[PDB]
Point group: C3
Chain length 262, copies 3
């Protein structure tokens, strides 16, 4: 039972952080690990790996951390590192950190990801609010008849708040694909056709789980690269890995500024 | 294997219903269940849990009811209560009633479901014949080289008959997505770009299992709401649930009227 | 370790063929099996079932061979037969042959398949190079975190060399779907909107795994029919299974000529 397990993770978070409630949670995955530092000074860091339901049984590699970051009166549960459906994990493990954070008190989930830009405009290193997603994984983390409306899955209010801190923030539609391979240029063209501005390999399940749980979601993509076939050149690994890192800098700090608006 | 379990279920069904052939099956999906009551004069009802292979090893709720009913010159195997793929279940379980049906004599499977309407001119509470589908599940109920052709998977003949019963019947293309979450508006715009008129969370696999097994299929969606982002206002749990307790005697009258024409 | 298993496999190839490296692998599946004898005299033939990682206990039928054929400058591993996701095998097993091939020295994989033609200039019996693919399986043979750019997944250079042998060779984007059911005509319309020229039931994962493993890939579809709804007439397990076994000599000879240009 995932809510039951989320409640244990949440008890342990409370126990280990000494903080009984955590009213915002921020998942920083690929491309966004620069963002961690920059959310602000953690009072507790712990390994996610320790936590009930967290870093998956089968494959145990080395998860990231759960930081407890006060931002004013908001106690931010920072999830530095996430697991991905592409790693083989049953989606309940994939969304468990989100569900744990809910149980730990998160009103709002800030879900971040590394994305390829599908769009004209888009610059490498550009943060892009997610206005909506395409779930192109053919899955849901919801099992049974949990029929969650995904209208305004990425809170307009939270996009408004974020633009209060950076009025020049774009938004775009994120296509969530399983990965972990990057996309073909034909898949990219397809995704342009399907209505996506961004493409990536996470997030959609987390949002769904977050929304199912009642949490408001702020989604932020970092364009780590223009998607395949957009420029005419192959993808640069160093660019995907590093070109957005000062962005993820910038953004964690911007982050802290937006959470403070919550 | 699945086919042998389907024939075992069929034997138990013939035994327990006293009916050697049920030349029609009806699967009563979300929002169609109340329609059972207006179907005719069933002569056996048995809990589906009674039947070999009906209840999956994984989840256990309260399985539905299997009704044997004469309608016109047909014996109709009515499945009230179904399992869904979104409940976690191997598809062999999701299509088993259809396979058990065909093994029990079924030549025509009447597959009903609840759909978001993707054309803003479909009326909430109006049935729509499925003229075709988009299997967006990335799954098939068929295993190994079962290379079934799905041209006219939804028999034009049956839709023609259905329309003699009710010539105000729309037809349209149904996108089968896994569920159980509803679609984002962005997914809805994609679905429209993809040529879908209806969207739901079932049927596709049963259609495919039915065509494989050589049964013809009449698919009928109840538009229980306009899909996400169509209205410019969020979906409402309040409509999706009642949308066909209201259509109930009318849907069961339609069903019985169309089956009689078969 | 998939890669270790590949390695285990490649040492048998070396050992049973007596040749330390096969610089080209060809995967013959559906529609291309008859072409094998026309490729050349094999210096060795081993059943696939004898190699580590290759074929099942659960479901056992009767499996392909692996041939070692010199072709032009090349020592070619011929994989006669493949297994398919639609048979239900973990993808690690589906792409093991290619990974084994790559481990055996294959830096070029020629992946052949049978496809529905969606594009107006294609005809039944035509070989079509695969220019790009749409992976519509919602799966990936990659797990965890290799960085795999699928830009030029189907090497333009291999395509241009092939065309030095038969410049006749058309090319198209291949949509790789789960199978084993064929597509509904609405699905084919969608695929066309998605930019697919060809549709089939294999290849994409074997590509990905070849690309991740550092091989270039030439894809060859045999158009074994038009896609569903193109002719307004059903589809064929065996106008598919060989509207190209009509042309064994030519298909083997096409392959041998193309490979000689590499
Ligand atoms: N799928 C995909 N992911 C990317 C790309 N660039 C960076 N990432 C990071 O992983 C995907 C997370 O949403 C890209 O072009 N495509
Ligand atoms: N997938 C999907 N299913 C719907 C929609 N409206 C009604 N249904 C079916 O709801 C009953 C449970 O699936 C919709 O908009 N999308
Ligand atoms: N998916 C798909 N595969 C095809 C089609 N035609 C030939 N093939 C290849 O068939 C795979 C099973 O033989 C088609 O129209 N669709």
């Amino acid at each position: 039972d995932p809510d039951e397990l989320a409640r244990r993770a949440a008890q342990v978070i409370a126990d280990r952080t000494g903080i009984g409630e955590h009213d915002v949670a921020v998942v920083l995955g690929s491309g966004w690990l620069p963002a961690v530092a920059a959310l602000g000074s953690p009072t507790t860091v712990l390994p996610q790996a320790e936590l009930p339901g967290f870093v998956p049984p089968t494959a145990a590699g080395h998860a990231g951390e759960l930081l407890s970051v006060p931002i004013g009166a908001h106690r931010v549960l920072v999830l530095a590192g996430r697991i991905h459906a592409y790693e083989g994990h049953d989606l309940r493990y994939v969304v468990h950190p989100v569900r744990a954070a809910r149980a730990a008190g998160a009103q709002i989930m800030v879900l971040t990801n590394a994305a390829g830009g599908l769009r004209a405009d888009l610059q490498v290193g550009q943060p892009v609010l997610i206005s909506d997603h395409l779930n192109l994984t053919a899955r849901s983390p919801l099992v049974g008849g949990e029929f969650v409306d995904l209208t305004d899955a990425y809170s307009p209010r939270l996009r408004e708040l974020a633009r209060q801190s950076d009025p020049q923030l774009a938004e775009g539609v994120y296509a969530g694909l399983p990965g972990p391979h990057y996309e073909t240029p034909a898949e990219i063209r397809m995704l342009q056709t399907l209505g996506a501005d961004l493409v990536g390999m996470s997030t959609v399940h987390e949002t769904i789980a977050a929304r199912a749980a009642g949490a408001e979601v702020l989604g932020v993509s970092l364009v780590t690269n223009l998607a395949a076939g957009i420029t005419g050149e192959p993808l640069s690994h160093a660019e995907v890995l590093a070109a957005g890192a000062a962005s993820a800098t910038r953004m964690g700090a911007l982050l802290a500024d937006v959470i403070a608006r919550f």
